[PDB]
Scaffold this motif. Structure first.
Motif, PDB file in Angstrom:
ATOM      1  N   UNK A  93       9.045 -81.863  35.276  1.00 40.90           N
ATOM      2  CA  UNK A  93       9.071 -82.607  34.024  1.00 40.90           C
ATOM      3  C   UNK A  93       7.992 -82.162  33.045  1.00 40.90           C
ATOM      4  N   UNK A  94       7.025 -81.364  33.489  1.00 39.96           N
ATOM      5  CA  UNK A  94       6.002 -80.848  32.601  1.00 39.96           C
ATOM      6  C   UNK A  94       4.834 -81.791  32.401  1.00 39.96           C
ATOM      7  N   UNK A  95       3.685 -81.244  32.013  1.00 36.57           N
ATOM      8  CA  UNK A  95       2.493 -82.027  31.719  1.00 36.57           C
ATOM      9  C   UNK A  95       1.980 -81.653  30.338  1.00 36.57           C
ATOM     10  N   UNK A  96       1.734 -82.654  29.499  1.00 34.78           N
ATOM     11  CA  UNK A  96       1.190 -82.412  28.171  1.00 34.78           C
ATOM     12  C   UNK A  96      -0.328 -82.311  28.284  1.00 34.78           C
ATOM     13  N   UNK A  97      -0.883 -81.207  27.792  1.00 38.69           N
ATOM     14  CA  UNK A  97      -2.305 -80.911  27.900  1.00 38.69           C
ATOM     15  C   UNK A  97      -2.831 -80.633  26.501  1.00 38.69           C
ATOM     16  N   UNK A 106      18.766 -81.245  44.716  1.00 44.45           N
ATOM     17  CA  UNK A 106      18.331 -80.996  46.085  1.00 44.45           C
ATOM     18  C   UNK A 106      16.814 -81.108  46.208  1.00 44.45           C
ATOM     19  N   UNK A 107      16.104 -80.139  45.637  1.00 41.31           N
ATOM     20  CA  UNK A 107      14.646 -80.124  45.688  1.00 41.31           C
ATOM     21  C   UNK A 107      14.092 -80.822  44.456  1.00 41.31           C
ATOM     22  N   UNK A 108      13.167 -81.752  44.676  1.00 41.46           N
ATOM     23  CA  UNK A 108      12.568 -82.543  43.611  1.00 41.46           C
ATOM     24  C   UNK A 108      11.177 -82.006  43.313  1.00 41.46           C
ATOM     25  N   UNK A 109      10.819 -81.975  42.030  1.00 44.53           N
ATOM     26  CA  UNK A 109       9.517 -81.503  41.576  1.00 44.53           C
ATOM     27  C   UNK A 109       8.785 -82.626  40.855  1.00 44.53           C
ATOM     28  N   UNK A 110       7.508 -82.801  41.188  1.00 47.43           N
ATOM     29  CA  UNK A 110       6.638 -83.776  40.541  1.00 47.43           C
ATOM     30  C   UNK A 110       5.405 -83.052  40.022  1.00 47.43           C
ATOM     31  N   UNK A 111       5.072 -83.286  38.758  1.00 45.84           N
ATOM     32  CA  UNK A 111       3.885 -82.726  38.136  1.00 45.84           C
ATOM     33  C   UNK A 111       2.881 -83.838  37.858  1.00 45.84           C
ATOM     34  N   UNK A 112       1.691 -83.439  37.421  1.00 38.35           N
ATOM     35  CA  UNK A 112       0.604 -84.380  37.182  1.00 38.35           C
ATOM     36  C   UNK A 112       0.858 -85.149  35.885  1.00 38.35           C
ATOM     37  N   UNK A 113      -0.120 -85.955  35.470  1.00 37.60           N
ATOM     38  CA  UNK A 113      -0.008 -86.726  34.250  1.00 37.60           C
ATOM     39  C   UNK A 113      -0.524 -85.975  33.035  1.00 37.60           C
ATOM     40  N   UNK A 114      -0.525 -86.679  31.905  1.00 27.07           N
ATOM     41  CA  UNK A 114      -1.048 -86.116  30.669  1.00 27.07           C
ATOM     42  C   UNK A 114      -2.545 -85.870  30.796  1.00 27.07           C
ATOM     43  N   UNK A 124      -9.136 -76.836  33.690  1.00 31.73           N
ATOM     44  CA  UNK A 124      -8.131 -77.855  33.965  1.00 31.73           C
ATOM     45  C   UNK A 124      -7.285 -77.412  35.151  1.00 31.73           C
ATOM     46  N   UNK A 125      -7.070 -78.335  36.088  1.00 35.37           N
ATOM     47  CA  UNK A 125      -6.317 -78.085  37.311  1.00 35.37           C
ATOM     48  C   UNK A 125      -5.046 -78.923  37.279  1.00 35.37           C
ATOM     49  N   UNK A 126      -3.899 -78.271  37.454  1.00 35.55           N
ATOM     50  CA  UNK A 126      -2.592 -78.914  37.389  1.00 35.55           C
ATOM     51  C   UNK A 126      -1.878 -78.688  38.714  1.00 35.55           C
ATOM     52  N   UNK A 127      -1.307 -79.758  39.261  1.00 32.07           N
ATOM     53  CA  UNK A 127      -0.623 -79.740  40.545  1.00 32.07           C
ATOM     54  C   UNK A 127       0.885 -79.780  40.342  1.00 32.07           C
ATOM     55  N   UNK A 128       1.621 -79.303  41.346  1.00 32.64           N
ATOM     56  CA  UNK A 128       3.080 -79.284  41.329  1.00 32.64           C
ATOM     57  C   UNK A 128       3.569 -79.461  42.761  1.00 32.64           C
TER      58      UNK A 128
END
Ligand code: NAG
Ligand code: NAG
Ligand code: NAG
Ligand code: NAG
Lengths: 121, 288, 108, 241, 49
Positions: A113-117, A1-9, A18-22
């Motif tokens: 999907x997560x972001x590798x930092x 139903x609801x889709x989630x998108x995260x930033x890149x590596x 560090x700033x991470x978006x969702x």
């Protein structure tokens, strides 16, 4: 139903923030609560913070005072977390999760999907 | 929904009901007793409407009146169900009876019925487009040279739907057979119009030879003769013939020679009149 | 803080088998608990919250059972897609801790 | 009554009940002490008459505010979240649930409306989330001055007193229509006795006499048997045929 | 379980509705008979004619 998108590596030196978006898409936005979770490559998961944007309550883990802050924008319909003063043991996969009022805020219904930092020299 | 313009327009037929349409009035057992009962019945030897299906495609919308007698001379299960309601739309509550190849389904919902609902292996059910508010469901065992004669009586009394049914192997045949109670339903809705449901075999589609008859009930008094096994064997219409009236008065099937006082006659009024004084002055109520 | 342990750490099971995983907190946490499964390298997915309620879309085979300080997750007939890492998460009081993570594998 | 989570008071649930047999006596085992106020009908006489439909509304409210769920009352919950008509017949069952709806950190999943333009008509739902412009300046959806969000949270904690502990509330509403009654309670039964002059009741049919084995053969649908003198003489046992 | 105290309390409050406010009830039962009536209301006697 609801889709989630995260930033890149994200790759950086230890001495910065560090700033991470969702981004979450689907259904009414005001009924969602945003949770941030860590996953180190060499261990399991660990929770840091939870935000309720419509009620304005932020709650962080005891070992993360003064280092991470979590906010949200209703116009962009997004959540953001910023973590400052990075140390080498902070490299990990960052997971954004969503809880629904119909149900529970504390539980995580949908996961990104997560972001590798990584931080090094 | 599919609009059918392959109809052949013919006037409905009329035939004689003979002595068909009798059912058990209640749940009481009687043996070797003649009993007089006043209830909604179908008169003997009355007009009954006749519809053919074959390119005859007779699916008109009929009034329900106070109750309906539905007979079908049929084979190979062409007839499938019925629809009941007032407006046959989602605005009001509607009732649907179907008997597919699996079982019998009874539903009470605000269906949006198609203009031409039917059934088309048969797995194409064009009966309704939606079901918004469903308040009653029921599942029951299947009800099922022309060889089948199926008789049904549908009544709606004080919020209860009563269905009586009978099946016989054989125009309307001459004979006598009581109808046993089949289904009682606490629906509690108003029904004033109805429609039948046919099944079409796709080959586009061909309709086999079938015929059904519709009659309307009204209240009257019958005399029923129970045998010693509790089965209704014969009935007498107390208002059909003067001889039948005498039989009802004497409460016997045979009357001896003589003269008998049966009832009284009186001519009914023809129209109505009213006369009042020629005044057109309103009374002083605002001033009070 | 609440420190909880998931047991056993390593389990070997096979297709069609019946398995269970225990998960015990240090002190009482009422019945606030959630379970998640993780494929290797994929995102976590919720299965059961409140330790009894089963999340929509998850097969009904998974069953949670527990009242306090002791919870179990049970699988009746295992399938090859059930091999994952299982994590608990209690959300009574702040500092929501996670579990060690039980990895279920086949017998070689 | 055994659901895991109840709906919020502002978005209170609505459940329809019909064509069922209801045993209300079990509702006396919920808690050692709980309110069981009933309006227009005595609770001890709920197992005899019956209705056409039943309406059940379930939610969770603060303990000291439970007194507002009643006809003729007023306050905050009464006119902004759930309004009961004055001409109301039915029952309200509220019991403490501190062991099931309390979080040490704090329960925030339960919400209640605080601001509304007007009151609520009986049996009305308002699930709007538009900002409330308390003053004259239109803020167009920013919670600044004279602009407050209508919803607030019951931050439930087990350390709270009895006056703030959560209470689960279920309201049952009955009514009479022309449609036949169908939600009727249990009628019980008694073991049979034969060959003795006894008083008997068969499906509401009174009688007094000696019950003997019968050679009569009813039709399958037949219920009673009547003799020549128009009296009941043969009966079919409702339990065993 | 399945063992209830038979008594309950009328938690009377002034903020209740009309249908729950307390009502005081007094029932007078008479036993009108031919026995010497010891409770007779106000009337007037008269000379014996
Ligand atoms: C059936 O109707 C026709 C005309 O509609 C009439 O002539 C005929 O008499 C009717 N049948 C009987 C048995 O009266
Ligand atoms: C059908 O019955 C209902 C109530 O039983 C009544 O309100 C309604 O007017 C009836 N329909 C018509 C067409 O009169
Ligand atoms: C009545 O039943 C008996 C046995 O059940 C049978 O012998 C008899 O023929 C039946 N009577 C009629 C009229 O069918
Ligand atoms: C009613 O229950 C009894 C046992 O409790 C059983 O023997 C009997 O067959 C039942 N009758 C029906 C009609 O279900």
């Amino acid at each position: 139903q609801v889709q989630l998108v995260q930033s890149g590596a994200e790759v950086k030196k230890p001495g910065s923030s560090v700033k991470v978006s969702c981004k979450a898409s689907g259904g009414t936005f005001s009924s969602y609560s945003f949770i941030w979770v860590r996953q180190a490559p060499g261990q399991g998961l660990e929770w840091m913070g939870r935000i309720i944007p419509i009620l304005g309550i932020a709650n962080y883990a005891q070992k993360f005072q003064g280092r991470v802050t979590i906010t949200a924008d209703k116009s962009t319909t997004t959540a953001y977390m910023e973590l400052s003063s990075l140390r080498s043991e902070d490299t990990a996969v960052y997971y954004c999760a969503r809880g629904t009022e119909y149900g529970d805020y504390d539980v995580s219904h949908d996961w990104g999907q997560g972001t590798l930092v990584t931080v090094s020299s | 929904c599919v609009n059918l313009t392959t109809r052949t327009q013919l006037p409905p037929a009329y035939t004689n009901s003979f002595t068909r349409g009798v059912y058990y009035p209640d749940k009481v057992f009687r043996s070797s007793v003649l009993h007089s009962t006043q209830d909604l019945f179908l008169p003997f030897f009355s007009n009954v409407t006749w519809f053919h299906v074959i390119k005859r495609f007779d699916n008109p919308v009929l009034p329900f009146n106070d109750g309906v007698y539905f007979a079908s001379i049929e084979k190979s299960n062409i007839i499938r169900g019925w629809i009941f309601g007032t407006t046959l739309d989602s605005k009001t509550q509607s009732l649907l009876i179907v008997n597919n190849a699996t079982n019998v389904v009874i539903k009470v919902c605000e269906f949006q019925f198609c203009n031409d609902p039917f059934l088309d292996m048969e797995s194409e059910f064009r009966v309704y487009s939606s079901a918004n508010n469903c308040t009653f469901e029921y599942v029951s065992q299947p009800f099922l040279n022309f060889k089948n004669l199926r008789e049904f009586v549908f009544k709606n009394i004080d919020g209860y739907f009563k269905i009586y049914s009978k099946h016989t192997p054989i125009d309307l045949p001459q004979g006598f057979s009581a109808l046993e109670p089949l289904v009682d339903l606490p629906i509690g809705i108003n029904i004033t119009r109805f429609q039948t449901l046919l099944a079409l075999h796709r080959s586009g589609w061909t309709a086999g030879a079938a015929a059904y008859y519709v009659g309307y009930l009204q209240p009257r008094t019958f005399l029923l003769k129970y045998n010693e096994n509790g089965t209704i064997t014969d009935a007498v219409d107390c208002a059909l013939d003067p001889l039948s009236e005498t039989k009802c008065t004497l409460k016997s099937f045979t009357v001896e020679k003589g003269i008998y006082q049966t009832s009284n006659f009186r001519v009914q009024p023809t129209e109505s009149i009213v006369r009042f004084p020629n005044i057109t002055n309103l009374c002083p109520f605002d001033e009070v | 803080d609440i420190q909880m342990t998931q047991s056993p750490s390593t389990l070997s099971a096979s297709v069609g088998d019946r398995v269970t995983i225990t998960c015990r907190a240090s002190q009482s946490i009422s019945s606030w608990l959630a379970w998640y499964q993780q494929k290797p390298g994929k995102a976590p997915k919720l299965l059961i919250y409140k330790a009894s309620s089963l999340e929509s879309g998850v097969p009904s085979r998974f069953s949670g059972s527990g009242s306090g300080t002791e919870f179990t997750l049970t699988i009746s007939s295992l399938q090859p897609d059930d091999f994952a890492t299982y994590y608990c998460q209690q959300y009574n009081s702040y500092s929501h801790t996670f579990g060690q993570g039980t990895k279920l594998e086949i017998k070689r | 009554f055994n659901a895991t989570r109840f709906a919020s008071v502002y978005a209170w649930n609505r459940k329809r009940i019909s064509n069922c047999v209801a045993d209300y006596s079990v509702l006396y085992n919920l808690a050692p002490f709980f309110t069981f106020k009933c309006y227009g009908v005595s609770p001890t006489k709920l197992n005899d008459l019956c209705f056409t439909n039943v309406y059940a509304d379930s939610f969770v409210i603060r303990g000291d505010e439970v007194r507002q769920i009643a006809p003729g009352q007023t306050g905050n919950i009464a006119d902004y979240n759930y309004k009961l008509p004055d001409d109301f017949t039915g029952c309200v069952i509220a019991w403490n649930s501190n062991k099931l709806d309390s979080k040490v950190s704090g329960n925030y999943n339960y919400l209640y409306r605080l601001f509304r333009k007007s009151n609520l008509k009986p049996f009305e739902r308002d699930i709007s989330t538009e900002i409330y412009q308390a003053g004259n300046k239109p803020c167009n959806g920013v919670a600044g001055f004279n602009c407050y969000f209508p919803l607030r949270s019951y931050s439930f904690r087990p350390t709270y007193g009895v006056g703030h502990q959560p209470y689960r509330v279920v309201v049952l509403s009955f009514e009479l229509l022309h449609a036949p009654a169908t939600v009727c309670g249990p009628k019980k039964s008694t073991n049979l006795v034969k060959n003795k002059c006894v008083n008997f009741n068969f499906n509401g049919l009174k009688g007094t006499g000696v019950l003997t084995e019968s050679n009569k053969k009813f039709l399958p649908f037949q219920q009673f048997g009547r003799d020549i003198a128009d009296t009941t003489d043969a009966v079919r046992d409702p339990q065993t045929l």
